[PDB]
Amino acid sequence: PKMKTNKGAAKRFKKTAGGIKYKHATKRHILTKRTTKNKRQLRPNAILPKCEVAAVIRMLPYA
């Protein structure tokens, strides 16, 4: 059949020219105790490390 996309992966990993882009973890709750520095630096989306990519690509066959 046609490969199905893992919609979990799709909703968390977006392909750009610069690689698979993702939202950092640990910015959902329990933030009072965290530093504004730490919270600030997590706010920008990031590109996945090389080791994380192969899987994601197998989960995102059309992306």
Binding site: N6, A9, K11, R12, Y22, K23, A55, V56
Partner: protein, 96 residues
């Protein structure tokens, strides 16, 4: 995506964003593609006829990629400042 039962990467990382509906019926057009259009008027129908946009497209942005060598009147579509310049430089108009 299975990692031996450790919380996988596709779950330890948060979901983010949404899809606009407009995105699904929008299409960028390169300035070089405007060559393929037959006739002066570059509109949604003429783009569709040239197969430059699919028939479900509703909103088009022309972008500065390549060169325009003919005078075209772009009606109805959005153009980039750079593309506008290039259109106007090749004796085109940008209608509203």
């Amino acid at each position: 995506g299975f990692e031996g039962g450790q919380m996988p990467l596709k779950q330890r990382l948060p979901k983010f964003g949404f899809t606009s509906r407009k995105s699904l019926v929008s299409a960028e057009v390169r300035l070089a593609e405007l060559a393929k259009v037959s006739g002066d008027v570059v509109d949604l129908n003429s783009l569709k006829a040239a197969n430059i946009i699919t028939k479900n497209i509703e909103f088009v942005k022309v972008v500065l990629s390549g060169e325009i060598n003919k005078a075209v009147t772009v009606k109805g579509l959005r153009v980039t400042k750079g593309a506008k310049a290039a259109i106007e430089a090749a004796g085109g108009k940008i209608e509203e």
